[PDB]
Write a protein that binds this ligand. Sequence first.
Ligand code: 3K5
Ligand code: PAR
Ligand code: PAR
Ligand code: PAR
Ligand code: PAR
Ligand code: PAR
Ligand code: PAR
Ligand code: MG
Ligand code: MG
Ligand code: MG
Ligand code: MG
Ligand code: MG
Ligand code: MG
Ligand code: MG
Ligand code: MG
Ligand code: MG
Ligand code: MG
Ligand code: MG
Ligand code: MG
Ligand code: MG
Ligand code: MG
Ligand code: MG
Ligand code: MG
Ligand code: MG
Ligand code: MG
Ligand code: MG
Ligand code: MG
Ligand code: MG
Ligand code: MG
Ligand code: MG
Ligand code: MG
Ligand code: MG
Ligand code: MG
Ligand code: MG
Ligand code: MG
Ligand code: MG
Ligand code: MG
Ligand code: MG
Ligand code: MG
Ligand code: MG
Ligand code: MG
Ligand code: MG
Ligand code: MG
Ligand code: MG
Ligand code: MG
Ligand code: MG
Ligand code: MG
Ligand code: MG
Ligand code: MG
Ligand code: MG
Ligand code: MG
Ligand code: MG
Ligand code: MG
Ligand code: MG
Ligand code: MG
Ligand code: MG
Ligand code: MG
Ligand code: MG
Ligand code: MG
Ligand code: MG
Ligand code: MG
Ligand code: MG
Ligand code: MG
Ligand code: MG
Ligand code: MG
Ligand code: MG
Ligand code: MG
Ligand code: MG
Ligand code: MG
Ligand code: MG
Ligand code: MG
Ligand code: MG
Ligand code: MG
Ligand code: MG
Ligand code: MG
Ligand code: MG
Ligand code: MG
Ligand code: MG
Ligand code: MG
Ligand code: MG
Ligand code: MG
Ligand code: MG
Ligand code: MG
Ligand code: MG
Ligand code: MG
Ligand code: MG
Ligand code: MG
Ligand code: MG
Ligand code: MG
Ligand code: MG
Ligand code: MG
Ligand code: MG
Ligand code: MG
Ligand code: MG
Ligand code: MG
Ligand code: MG
Ligand code: MG
Ligand code: MG
Ligand code: MG
Ligand code: MG
Ligand code: MG
Ligand code: ZN
Lengths: 159, 61, 144, 100, 185, 103
Amino acid sequence: GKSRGYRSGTRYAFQRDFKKHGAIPLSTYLKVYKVGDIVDIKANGSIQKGMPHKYYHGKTGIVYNVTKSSVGVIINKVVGNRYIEKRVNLRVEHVKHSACRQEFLNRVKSNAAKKREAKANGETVYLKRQAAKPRGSRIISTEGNIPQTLAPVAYETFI
Amino acid sequence: AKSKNHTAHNQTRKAHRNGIKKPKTYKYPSLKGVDAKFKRNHRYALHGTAKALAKARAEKS
Amino acid sequence: RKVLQLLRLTQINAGVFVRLTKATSELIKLAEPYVAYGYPSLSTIRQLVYKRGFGKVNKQRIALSDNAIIEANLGKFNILSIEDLIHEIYTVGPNFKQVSNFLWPFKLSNPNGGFRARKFQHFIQGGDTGNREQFINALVKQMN
Amino acid sequence: AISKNLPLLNNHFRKHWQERVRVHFDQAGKKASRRQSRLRKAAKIAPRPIDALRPVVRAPTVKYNRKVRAGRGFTLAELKAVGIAPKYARTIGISVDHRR
Amino acid sequence: GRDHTSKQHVRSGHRTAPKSDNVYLQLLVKLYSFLARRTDAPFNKVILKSLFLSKINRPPVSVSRISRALKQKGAAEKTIVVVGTVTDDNRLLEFPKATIAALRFTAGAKDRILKNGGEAITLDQLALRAPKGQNTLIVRGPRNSREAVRHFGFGPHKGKAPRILSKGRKFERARGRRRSRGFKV
Amino acid sequence: VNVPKTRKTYCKGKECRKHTQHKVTQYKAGKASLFAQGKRRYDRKQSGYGGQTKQIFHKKAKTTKKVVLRLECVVCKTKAQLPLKRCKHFELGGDKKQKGQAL
RNA sequence: GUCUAACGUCUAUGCGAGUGUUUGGGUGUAAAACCCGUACGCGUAAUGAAAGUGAACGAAGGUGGGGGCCCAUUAGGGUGCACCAUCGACCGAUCCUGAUGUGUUCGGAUGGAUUUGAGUAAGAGCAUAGCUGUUGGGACCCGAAAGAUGGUGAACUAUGCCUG
RNA sequence: GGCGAAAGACUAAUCGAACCAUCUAGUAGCUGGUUCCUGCCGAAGUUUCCCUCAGGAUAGCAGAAGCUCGUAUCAGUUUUAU
RNA sequence: UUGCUUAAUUGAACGUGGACAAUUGAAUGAAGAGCUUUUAGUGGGCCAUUUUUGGUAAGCAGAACUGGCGAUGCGGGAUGA
RNA sequence: CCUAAGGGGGACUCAUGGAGAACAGAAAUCUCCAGUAGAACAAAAGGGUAAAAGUCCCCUUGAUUUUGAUUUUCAGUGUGAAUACAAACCAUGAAAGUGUGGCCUAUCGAUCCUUUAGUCCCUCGGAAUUUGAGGCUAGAGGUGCCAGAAAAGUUACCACAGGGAUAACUGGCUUGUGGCAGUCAAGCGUUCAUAGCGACAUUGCUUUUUGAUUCUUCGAUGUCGGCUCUUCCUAUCAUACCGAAGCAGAAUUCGGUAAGCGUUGGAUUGUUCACCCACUAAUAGGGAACGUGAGCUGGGUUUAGACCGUCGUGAGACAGGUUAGUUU
RNA sequence: GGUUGCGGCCAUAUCUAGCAGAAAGCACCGUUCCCCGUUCGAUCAACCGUAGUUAAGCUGCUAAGAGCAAUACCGAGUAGUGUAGUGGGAGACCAUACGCGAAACUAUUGUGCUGCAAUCU
Ligand SMILES: CC(=O)O[C@@H]1[C@@H](O)[C@H](O[C@H]2[C@H](OC(=O)[C@H]3CC[C@@H]4[C@H](C3)O[C@@]3(C[C@H](OC(=O)/C=C/c5ccccc5)[C@H](C)CO3)[C@]43CO3)O[C@H](C)[C@@H](O)[C@@H]2OC(C)=O)O[C@H](C)[C@H]1O
Ligand SMILES: NC[C@@H]1O[C@H](O[C@H]2[C@@H](O)[C@H](O[C@@H]3[C@@H](O)[C@H](N)C[C@H](N)[C@H]3O[C@H]3O[C@H](CO)[C@@H](O)[C@H](O)[C@H]3N)O[C@@H]2CO)[C@H](N)[C@@H](O)[C@@H]1O
Ligand SMILES: NC[C@@H]1O[C@H](O[C@H]2[C@@H](O)[C@H](O[C@@H]3[C@@H](O)[C@H](N)C[C@H](N)[C@H]3O[C@H]3O[C@H](CO)[C@@H](O)[C@H](O)[C@H]3N)O[C@@H]2CO)[C@H](N)[C@@H](O)[C@@H]1O
Ligand SMILES: NC[C@@H]1O[C@H](O[C@H]2[C@@H](O)[C@H](O[C@@H]3[C@@H](O)[C@H](N)C[C@H](N)[C@H]3O[C@H]3O[C@H](CO)[C@@H](O)[C@H](O)[C@H]3N)O[C@@H]2CO)[C@H](N)[C@@H](O)[C@@H]1O
Ligand SMILES: NC[C@@H]1O[C@H](O[C@H]2[C@@H](O)[C@H](O[C@@H]3[C@@H](O)[C@H](N)C[C@H](N)[C@H]3O[C@H]3O[C@H](CO)[C@@H](O)[C@H](O)[C@H]3N)O[C@@H]2CO)[C@H](N)[C@@H](O)[C@@H]1O
Ligand SMILES: NC[C@@H]1O[C@H](O[C@H]2[C@@H](O)[C@H](O[C@@H]3[C@@H](O)[C@H](N)C[C@H](N)[C@H]3O[C@H]3O[C@H](CO)[C@@H](O)[C@H](O)[C@H]3N)O[C@@H]2CO)[C@H](N)[C@@H](O)[C@@H]1O
Ligand SMILES: NC[C@@H]1O[C@H](O[C@H]2[C@@H](O)[C@H](O[C@@H]3[C@@H](O)[C@H](N)C[C@H](N)[C@H]3O[C@H]3O[C@H](CO)[C@@H](O)[C@H](O)[C@H]3N)O[C@@H]2CO)[C@H](N)[C@@H](O)[C@@H]1O
Ligand SMILES: [Mg+2]
Ligand SMILES: [Mg+2]
Ligand SMILES: [Mg+2]
Ligand SMILES: [Mg+2]
Ligand SMILES: [Mg+2]
Ligand SMILES: [Mg+2]
Ligand SMILES: [Mg+2]
Ligand SMILES: [Mg+2]
Ligand SMILES: [Mg+2]
Ligand SMILES: [Mg+2]
Ligand SMILES: [Mg+2]
Ligand SMILES: [Mg+2]
Ligand SMILES: [Mg+2]
Ligand SMILES: [Mg+2]
Ligand SMILES: [Mg+2]
Ligand SMILES: [Mg+2]
Ligand SMILES: [Mg+2]
Ligand SMILES: [Mg+2]
Ligand SMILES: [Mg+2]
Ligand SMILES: [Mg+2]
Ligand SMILES: [Mg+2]
Ligand SMILES: [Mg+2]
Ligand SMILES: [Mg+2]
Ligand SMILES: [Mg+2]
Ligand SMILES: [Mg+2]
Ligand SMILES: [Mg+2]
Ligand SMILES: [Mg+2]
Ligand SMILES: [Mg+2]
Ligand SMILES: [Mg+2]
Ligand SMILES: [Mg+2]
Ligand SMILES: [Mg+2]
Ligand SMILES: [Mg+2]
Ligand SMILES: [Mg+2]
Ligand SMILES: [Mg+2]
Ligand SMILES: [Mg+2]
Ligand SMILES: [Mg+2]
Ligand SMILES: [Mg+2]
Ligand SMILES: [Mg+2]
Ligand SMILES: [Mg+2]
Ligand SMILES: [Mg+2]
Ligand SMILES: [Mg+2]
Ligand SMILES: [Mg+2]
Ligand SMILES: [Mg+2]
Ligand SMILES: [Mg+2]
Ligand SMILES: [Mg+2]
Ligand SMILES: [Mg+2]
Ligand SMILES: [Mg+2]
Ligand SMILES: [Mg+2]
Ligand SMILES: [Mg+2]
Ligand SMILES: [Mg+2]
Ligand SMILES: [Mg+2]
Ligand SMILES: [Mg+2]
Ligand SMILES: [Mg+2]
Ligand SMILES: [Mg+2]
Ligand SMILES: [Mg+2]
Ligand SMILES: [Mg+2]
Ligand SMILES: [Mg+2]
Ligand SMILES: [Mg+2]
Ligand SMILES: [Mg+2]
Ligand SMILES: [Mg+2]
Ligand SMILES: [Mg+2]
Ligand SMILES: [Mg+2]
Ligand SMILES: [Mg+2]
Ligand SMILES: [Mg+2]
Ligand SMILES: [Mg+2]
Ligand SMILES: [Mg+2]
Ligand SMILES: [Mg+2]
Ligand SMILES: [Mg+2]
Ligand SMILES: [Mg+2]
Ligand SMILES: [Mg+2]
Ligand SMILES: [Mg+2]
Ligand SMILES: [Mg+2]
Ligand SMILES: [Mg+2]
Ligand SMILES: [Mg+2]
Ligand SMILES: [Mg+2]
Ligand SMILES: [Mg+2]
Ligand SMILES: [Mg+2]
Ligand SMILES: [Mg+2]
Ligand SMILES: [Mg+2]
Ligand SMILES: [Mg+2]
Ligand SMILES: [Mg+2]
Ligand SMILES: [Mg+2]
Ligand SMILES: [Mg+2]
Ligand SMILES: [Mg+2]
Ligand SMILES: [Mg+2]
Ligand SMILES: [Mg+2]
Ligand SMILES: [Mg+2]
Ligand SMILES: [Mg+2]
Ligand SMILES: [Mg+2]
Ligand SMILES: [Mg+2]
Ligand SMILES: [Mg+2]
Ligand SMILES: [Mg+2]
Ligand SMILES: [Mg+2]
Ligand SMILES: [Mg+2]
Ligand SMILES: [Zn+2]
């Protein structure tokens, strides 16, 4: 007999973290979610109402609806050869703001401040990010660092 | 008799000939499922908003 | 396969220029079992561009037989000559992307003198794939 | 047996329908013979008209009330009003309807 | 061998000629094949393309739509171009004086345009008074009001029209359209 | 299963439109009338020759039935029906549980 | 892998809020061609089980895009059909409210509702033809073991009888 | 139906239901076959339902017709952040 | 702007007006992107590396990813899906 | 399965251990300390839970009403189940709040028909009244093969369409099993591991067993055995030449090269196999489509006739016994 | 800086054993008519701030403390793993090549930080 129930295979996924069981710290209930916010979904095993399905555990999406104790999140789920918009109702215990917004919103502010300062200075500044490039030339001083010559060591048994 | 029970072989090939395609995004998403109390009120705020803007342009004509 | 397609390497003995960053380096690492690559000398670049240099103009593979073709397609990037293009490639310039994408992938022949006894193993282990660094110049001399 | 997005049809061809196919090849021939018979009847009874005088009557039902068409015969009251006996009227090219 | 990043030997997927063998429709494309080839005016390239379209791709344009199109601000004397038939609308209370260039006019449309002081010219007459399509306004008919589109994309909870021959309470109204008869889709 | 003989639920009658006290009774299927059209059609179909004309169910699988409560409002006498889950045993207004007593 | 009846998509054509002459009538150089019209079919209104009711707040709506056209002068602005996403308005059903009134049980104004329709929102259809696809037909061609109706056999043979 | 000292035997080389003609071109998810050339594109044996398991429907894979547009913003890939 | 929300002049959503101009905010590629209708065949599969289950095992039976054969000739493995 | 084992609130803290108290003891009841849950939460298991979700107490019926959206299975159809709101009416608590059944993951059911409830509304079509009937909305009566026919057997008298998509021979992979052989050497062998043996282990070989599988053959490869005849293998029974011995002789046993050469006559049995009698130098074991049926024979098996026993109500069944049964 | 009330993160804050703690606060502490709750004013309820005490709670310090946290020329580029070859090996398995890279172990260091309001030697 095959078993494919709603919470099948969630033995470890829906567990609380080790030494992190019990009551929810109330910052979870004090956070404010607005329509358009990006939130990660991670199911709390101790709150059984409003739990996401195991598919959305570990997924990240956008809030589209705000209710008394829950938020609505839009997830794009792959079904065959296209994506389908899934609209999941989640209590805020299973939701956390995505930390990817605050870095990108910070890169926008930093770009704006430098650009307006080069404009103030009558100069130019380049803002496109670049991947790490190969390192330049350099000179190695040997004062205190004359090279030590190594050789492969013979075979030994240590038991 | 007895046959093959299940296999996902060749299924990712079939999904990637023309699919695994991201849906298009639009400036206004559909508001299906948003709270009815807000949605009823969002109707009156927009209709009234349209009234104020209509009068401002009717002056400027 | 997708990585090689994105490097415009869609046939055997096809050659392309890559500016080493981290993104393009990890790309080449993905294609490593199927490519031989290395650090090209200035003369190797010149020989490639002179003999097998073609441009992509309105999606067509056109021989670089006159500096006017190069000017008409890369003058907004300050390339007015075949030597401007070679200079922009060799000392990787601010417009390396446009200049290298305008260049159609080089279609080399097989080496005169052959490959090693078995190609598809790293150059370090006696094969041909992976980074050979300065011996790519000898290989291009064999194949171009 | 059922396939695609198509309308569901009711094609009543489960009997021996091919034994009961009437193809009207003789449309033109019967038209011509009808015309010749009609000419024959006219030359037989000339100059008396081939058509009896028909009354004018309202069409029944709520759908055809507005329309008026040719009836079958003039009522006995109508013929009485013009001083023609029905027995005599049938002999002078007038149609009678005892039912209306 | 090649690792093809796209399908090889693919036709463009656009009409390059009318499907029609009407000799007079191809004479107009011959005029606009020349115009699209030589004037650099974007109007002429659109007309040549529009002359290739099929019948369902050239919906009839009512004379009321042209009336509403002429009611745009600063459009009272623009020249209306309809690549197709312009039909009449007996629901209008009034029609302006207008110049309309079309492939065809219906009798009511032609009478009403000329009765109200307007002109009903063909597209070749247009190409002489406006070889670059200056001060024009192209009107296209409704493409999605066609009956066949009612049944396109039919499915559960899709709200389209079933393909059905008869209409009534006994025809596809019980089970699957009603919660008292099972479910509703 | 033990259900009290009274209950305070919503009354849908227009006069009440509120929770009233409702008498609880077990619903009983009425006697099948001989002039329901399906019985009229069934009797005509079975007549004559041809044998049994409609199917007869045999392959019983359920061992219970859904118990239905008839809730009649004491204010307006409007009846309401509530189905319960499948129970093998069911009493109305039985002896309430006594927790703590000995065997 | 056919023909036919009825159909889906696409395309060409005629006319177009209409369309279809051919049931029939006229006519004829006679199954042709030519001509005629009342009706009728489909379309032009939907929705509800039904009684029934029945489509403009507005320039027949607003927003973000939108080819083309207009003014410009890189840019920018105006106008923006078709079409896309979205929010509204209107008609029918359902539920709620229930004005003046009244065959005092009828009437249903007004204002609403995460409800609902194969609807409106300046018509798009009708008709002919072709390929392809659908269903019924023998149905791409050939093929059962069987079932039914009506008839012909006891010159073989089984059994009775008659005469040898 | 007959007939059977009984074998399901015999009933015109036909018998666990004769022969003749018709219904009848009986039906067949099963066999077999299915007729000229070249050009371009080009699969599936997987999902769900089915007295479903040699079959259908359904989605997918494929072709064809195109239509709206013309670099708009996409990717069987990398980088960075999370 | 609102008939929702706040003790509120607080907020929510959608807006008017103003500021930030081509390094408009990583790489690489892009025979361009988006969209629609309709229909065929198919719905027995098998193999190789690796992960892997039953089994002493099997040229056995069953799954995971990819690539193949099927549907494919050509050079090599003598011969061989 | 549950009127609470549902809902709300409140109070308390569980398993277990130590130290103590008449009868009283390992277990009765009482006390303190310790006690992260080592318990309890209907039922499988997992997750979850400590001023609680557990234990106890108080009050209750939200296990109620109208319909929409969503998640899982998914075709993004149905069913089941669940989630978050909208609009009511309520319960509880000082309150914030919570409550749309069971802490979460299983605990279930279409069309047609009937029955009940609701609206007391629409229709019975020439017009009314009242019965009756028919409509609209929600439940119930059920399909467990659970997307849901109404259903007992036999055929050894048999038929048809097919299938090597699938069994009964050979053949192919495997070699558990069967058979044969090694290595290590604790023991046996009067002493003495290895003359001859050899446990516990362990590595193999073979395809003369039986399994396992289902690749070939179902538009057919004649299925047992015997007779006849040829050939091949060696894991050698005899014969030749030799090595070893717990080889005095005789006999015997172990081994090497060795398949050149032979390996029988009979009673019973269809037999293969078996078992006896007897000769013999010896009466070894096997393969060749389990060699060999257009070579035979046809005793067995396996059509139809028939008998018995057991089984079956019966038609009939038996891989049980018996007899007769076309070898092109 | 101490202290109280309400807290955020929820052991660098916990556990065990000692010792210390000014001022204020907190606390133990006294009483039972009243509201209230118990077998028991022990808990809960109410009253007094009067009669007493820092003994306890609490706070801080001590401990090669247990536990916890952080760091690393610690272990270890080890185990494992993505990719490659007509590499090795009868096989079991192993080496190499381009990449990614633990856990335990060991050593060292640390033992709450802090928001709003009020108050104090
Ligand atoms: C004696 C007996 O046991 O046989 C009865 C038969 O007599 C009975 O016939 C009834 C007959 O049944 C039918 O014609 C079918 C109607 C619906 C189908 C089926 C039978 O009932 C189902 C099955 C199932 O529920 C039942 O089973 C119904 C039981 C029933 C009993 C009495 C009256 C009505 C229904 C679904 C819930 C829906 O209804 C349905 C889809 O299968 O209907 C007539 C009105 C009755 O007169 C008639 O009852 C009598 C007295 O004879 O039907 C039952 C199914 C049988 O079990
Ligand atoms: N009047 C009903 C029938 O109509 C038939 O004719 C119908 C068909 O010939 C023709 O079919 C058209 C089709 O060509 C066109 N491309 C699309 C259109 N929807 C179809 O019409 C269809 O829908 C209409 C209702 O809208 C039905 O009445 C009609 O039967 C059906 N064929 O449209 C006609 C409209 O009825 C026949 N004359 C006959 O069977 C009968 O008269
Ligand atoms: N530091 C680089 C790494 O990149 C990793 O992932 C990067 C890519 O490898 C990965 O790409 C995956 C691709 O592997 C997978 N096969 C398909 C998937 N659609 C891609 O996903 C990505 O692209 C989609 C749109 O295509 C976007 O939603 C998004 O940028 C990202 N999820 O997603 C990232 C690119 O955006 C991880 N994010 C993380 O380990 C780390 O950031
Ligand atoms: N444990 C942190 C998780 O790892 C994520 O991503 C980590 C891995 O998943 C990711 O691995 C990527 C892989 O996704 C991708 N498909 C292929 C890529 N080669 C891998 O990257 C690997 O190699 C690159 C250099 O080539 C290194 O920079 C990287 O550290 C290494 N893991 O590299 C990251 C190394 O930390 C994110 N870094 C982080 O936000 C997330 O929480
Ligand atoms: N209820 C019993 C049935 O009623 C029959 O007669 C009934 C019918 O004439 C009529 O019943 C109508 C019916 O026409 C119609 N098709 C359906 C409608 N729901 C019925 O209505 C009836 O039933 C509902 C249900 O509870 C009641 O609320 C209501 O008071 C009652 N009139 O009203 C009568 C009952 O008041 C017979 N009396 C009886 O033989 C039959 O079994
Ligand atoms: N030697 C083993 C195998 O034997 C096979 O041949 C057959 C025989 O060895 C053996 O057949 C036996 C038979 O020996 C015996 N005397 C009678 C038995 N009815 C037969 O078959 C029996 O065994 C087979 C195999 O498991 C199964 O079908 C079943 O258990 C049973 N029918 O099993 C095989 C199939 O029946 C293969 N043909 C051969 O290639 C292979 O070597
Ligand atoms: N041929 C091979 C061998 O011959 C052997 O033969 C046996 C005897 O015939 C022989 O014994 C001797 C023989 O050595 C010698 N050279 C000749 C003498 N006549 C034999 O004598 C033997 O046979 C005679 C006659 O029948 C008897 O009377 C006497 O009892 C018997 N010992 O030696 C064996 C002792 O029993 C055996 N049959 C056997 O080992 C084997 O078959
Ligand atoms: Mg629950
Ligand atoms: Mg299958
Ligand atoms: Mg299965
Ligand atoms: Mg040479
Ligand atoms: Mg080629
Ligand atoms: Mg319209
Ligand atoms: Mg909808
Ligand atoms: Mg019908
Ligand atoms: Mg339901
Ligand atoms: Mg009768
Ligand atoms: Mg009778
Ligand atoms: Mg009858
Ligand atoms: Mg009958
Ligand atoms: Mg029945
Ligand atoms: Mg029965
Ligand atoms: Mg008409
Ligand atoms: Mg219409
Ligand atoms: Mg209004
Ligand atoms: Mg409405
Ligand atoms: Mg409703
Ligand atoms: Mg009323
Ligand atoms: Mg509405
Ligand atoms: Mg046939
Ligand atoms: Mg027959
Ligand atoms: Mg029959
Ligand atoms: Mg007869
Ligand atoms: Mg005789
Ligand atoms: Mg008789
Ligand atoms: Mg017999
Ligand atoms: Mg005979
Ligand atoms: Mg036949
Ligand atoms: Mg191709
Ligand atoms: Mg079924
Ligand atoms: Mg099967
Ligand atoms: Mg079949
Ligand atoms: Mg087959
Ligand atoms: Mg098909
Ligand atoms: Mg199919
Ligand atoms: Mg198969
Ligand atoms: Mg098949
Ligand atoms: Mg095939
Ligand atoms: Mg190949
Ligand atoms: Mg070859
Ligand atoms: Mg070989
Ligand atoms: Mg409980
Ligand atoms: Mg309770
Ligand atoms: Mg509590
Ligand atoms: Mg423990
Ligand atoms: Mg324990
Ligand atoms: Mg809705
Ligand atoms: Mg669904
Ligand atoms: Mg569902
Ligand atoms: Mg389920
Ligand atoms: Mg529920
Ligand atoms: Mg309240
Ligand atoms: Mg509530
Ligand atoms: Mg409910
Ligand atoms: Mg079930
Ligand atoms: Mg039911
Ligand atoms: Mg019913
Ligand atoms: Mg009943
Ligand atoms: Mg009924
Ligand atoms: Mg009547
Ligand atoms: Mg009545
Ligand atoms: Mg069962
Ligand atoms: Mg079934
Ligand atoms: Mg099923
Ligand atoms: Mg048998
Ligand atoms: Mg016979
Ligand atoms: Mg087979
Ligand atoms: Mg073995
Ligand atoms: Mg041994
Ligand atoms: Mg000894
Ligand atoms: Mg076999
Ligand atoms: Mg054969
Ligand atoms: Mg033969
Ligand atoms: Mg043979
Ligand atoms: Mg030997
Ligand atoms: Mg010897
Ligand atoms: Mg020999
Ligand atoms: Mg003998
Ligand atoms: Mg014998
Ligand atoms: Mg054998
Ligand atoms: Mg044999
Ligand atoms: Mg032979
Ligand atoms: Mg023979
Ligand atoms: Mg034989
Ligand atoms: Mg012979
Ligand atoms: Mg025989
Ligand atoms: Mg015999
Ligand atoms: Mg016998
Ligand atoms: Mg016999
Ligand atoms: Mg027998
Ligand atoms: Mg005999
Ligand atoms: Zn009431």
